[PDB]
From Swiss-Prot:
Annotated protein name in UniProt: Cytochrome c, testis-specific
Organism phylogeny: Eukaryota, Metazoa, Chordata, Craniata, Vertebrata
Cited function: Electron carrier protein. The oxidized form of the cytochrome c heme group can accept an electron from the heme group of the cytochrome c1 subunit of cytochrome reductase. Cytochrome c then transfers this electron to the cytochrome oxidase complex, the final protein carrier in the mitochondrial electron-transport chain. Plays a role in apoptosis. Suppression of the anti-apoptotic members or activation of the pro-apoptotic members of the Bcl-2 family leads to altered mitochondrial membrane permeability resulting in release of cytochrome c into the cytosol. Binding of cytochrome c to Apaf-1 triggers the activation of caspase-9, which then accelerates apoptosis by activating other caspases.
Positions that bind heme c: 14, 17-18, 80
Tissues and organs where the protein is expressed, per its UniProt entry: This is one of two isocytochromes C found in the testis. The other is identical with the form found in other mouse tissues. These cytochromes are assumed to be located in the sperm.
Predominant location: mitochondrion
PTM: Binds 1 heme c group covalently per subunit.
UniProtKB keywords: Acetylation, Apoptosis, Electron transport, Heme, Iron, Metal-binding, Mitochondrion, Phosphoprotein, Respiratory chain, Transport
Domain of life: Eukaryota
Origin species: Mus musculus (Mouse)
Gene3D superfamilies: Cytochrome c-like domain
Gene responsible for this protein: Cyct
Pfam family, one: Cytochrom_C
Amino acid sequence: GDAEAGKKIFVQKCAQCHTVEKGGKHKTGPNLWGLFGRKTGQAPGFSYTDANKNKGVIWSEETLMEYLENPKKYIPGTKMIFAGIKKKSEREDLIKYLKQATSS
Ligand code: HEM
């Protein structure tokens, strides 16, 4: 994974609805700090759909790779309205960036 490439992908496709830094604001979507190793739908203070709260998996590289390829397929009923990122390489780079930005 290439975090530098990932950072650019984040700005292009995710930043309009998400922040990732510690203490960052919730916007259309939840601030994502602390995401890795945590069960779905647990960002503090964000109002999730029951679907996002109930998916039940632990976010990590593997689960984010599947989710980001097609969000509504992975979480039917989600209010995250976004097509997904088809390219495996792009998802890997994006996730690399997310791991770095949301864990420090
Ligand atoms: C960009 C490609 C992108 C990423 C990365 C991303 C991630 C993401 C995660 C990991 C969650 C779940 C967090 C958790 O379970 O705690 C999540 C949730 C929502 N998102 Fe998102 N998201 C990306 C892009 C976008 C875009 C462009 C929007 C807005 C149009 C958006 C919105 C949302 C919303 C809303 C949620 C909450 C969904 C719910 O059902 O509660 N995301 N995202």
